[PDB]
């Protein structure tokens, strides 16, 4: 079912996180967008699998207004481009994006895609493709809760390249007091956003854990009820790993109902 995984101690540290086997987060999904008339794919963003034919992703990831049949959802993959053996692939049937996505503030950064399969089922559950558990509407994990995010994004802001292997990073949910515009260069922070990041620093330069460009649409999960539960979606942030500066995620809880209604048969 959900929030289950055959984890493994990741071994290959990286500036920004540490390398991790897809098996560790079997709900991680790679969304590839193609260019003008089949010249090739391109890593666009990440996806959180919530059901056999429904993946959650970031709203801003689709600013480009892609034609439905121009995105491909790939699951069960450890390497961004190197085809995994147990990987599963699906074409995008259709995809919604929050009707109020304020592009200026990433307000309401969330979108849903529907996997194209001639049947009411697409992705068959497996050890490399499994669904995450949505948060219960009443969930409210404590301050600084130890959570962990994953994706195929960049290893730092200015890097012209995406990670050839699924990176994983562990962070702490921030207290409401710190998740405010004052802490984030005056930029705006709405009540559908949540901050979480690494709290370490000081030592003569460190590689702090945090998502980065390419990581959007990915998950920010936390253990809850012995399972892994989606708490936030990777939305935005001041660079990648800045001292004292958290990353901003989407409160999955707030959009529970939107995620619900929007799945209409
Ligand atoms: C779509 C997703 O891959 C990413 C995820 C970013 C995750 N970052 C993190 N630290 N966890 N989404 C985005 O990149 C959305 N855009 C941003 O987050 C931008 C990136 C630009 C940058 O390098 O600062 N940051 S922003 O907060 O929305 C923004 C920041 C900023 C800072 C200074 C000056 C300006 N201008 C141009 C006035 C901006 C503008 C926007």
UniProtKB/Swiss-Prot annotation:
Coiled coil: none annotated. Residues 14-264 form the Peptidase S1 domain. The record marks 167, 215 as: Important for single-chain activity. The active site is at 60 (charge relay system), 109 (charge relay system), 216 (charge relay system). Disulfide bonds join 2-133, 45-61, 53-122, 147-222, 179-195, 212-240. Glycans are attached at residue 186. This is Tissue-type plasminogen activator chain B. The lineage of its organism: Eukaryota, Metazoa, Chordata, Craniata, Vertebrata. The gene is PLAT. The chain holds residues 299 to 562 of 562 of the full protein.
């Amino acid at each position: 079912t959900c929030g289950l995984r055959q984890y493994s101690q990741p071994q290959f540290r990286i500036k920004g996180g540490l390398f991790a086997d897809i098996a560790s987060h079997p709900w991680q999904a790679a969304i590839f967008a193609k260019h003008r008339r089949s010249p090739g794919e391109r890593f666009l963003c990440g996806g959180i699998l919530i059901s056999s034919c429904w993946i959650l992703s970031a709203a801003h990831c689709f600013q480009e207004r892609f034609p439905p049949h121009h995105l491909t959802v790939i699951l069960g993959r450890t390497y961004r481009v190197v085809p995994g053996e147990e990987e599963q692939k699906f074409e995008v049937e259709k995809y919604i994006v929050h009707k109020e996505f304020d592009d200026d503030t990433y307000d309401n950064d969330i979108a849903l895609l529907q996997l194209k399969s001639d049947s009411s089922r697409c992705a068959q559950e497996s050890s490399v493709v499994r669904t995450v558990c949505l948060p219960p509407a009443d969930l409210q994990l404590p301050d600084w809760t130890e959570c962990e995010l994953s994706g195929y994004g960049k290893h730092e802001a200015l890097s012209p390249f995406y990670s050839e292997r699924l990176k994983e990073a562990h962070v702490r949910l921030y207290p409401s007091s710190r998740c405010t515009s004052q802490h984030l260069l005056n930029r705006t922070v709405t009540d559908n956003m949540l901050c979480a990041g690494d709290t370490r620093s000081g030592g003569p330069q460190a590689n702090l854990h945090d998502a980065c460009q390419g990581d959007s649409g990915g998950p920010l999960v936390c253990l809850n009820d012995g399972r892994m539960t989606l708490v936030g979606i990777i939305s935005w942030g001041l660079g990648c790993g800045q001292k004292d500066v958290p990353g901003v995620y989407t409160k999955v809880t707030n959009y529970l109902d939107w995620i619900r209604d929007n799945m209409r048969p």
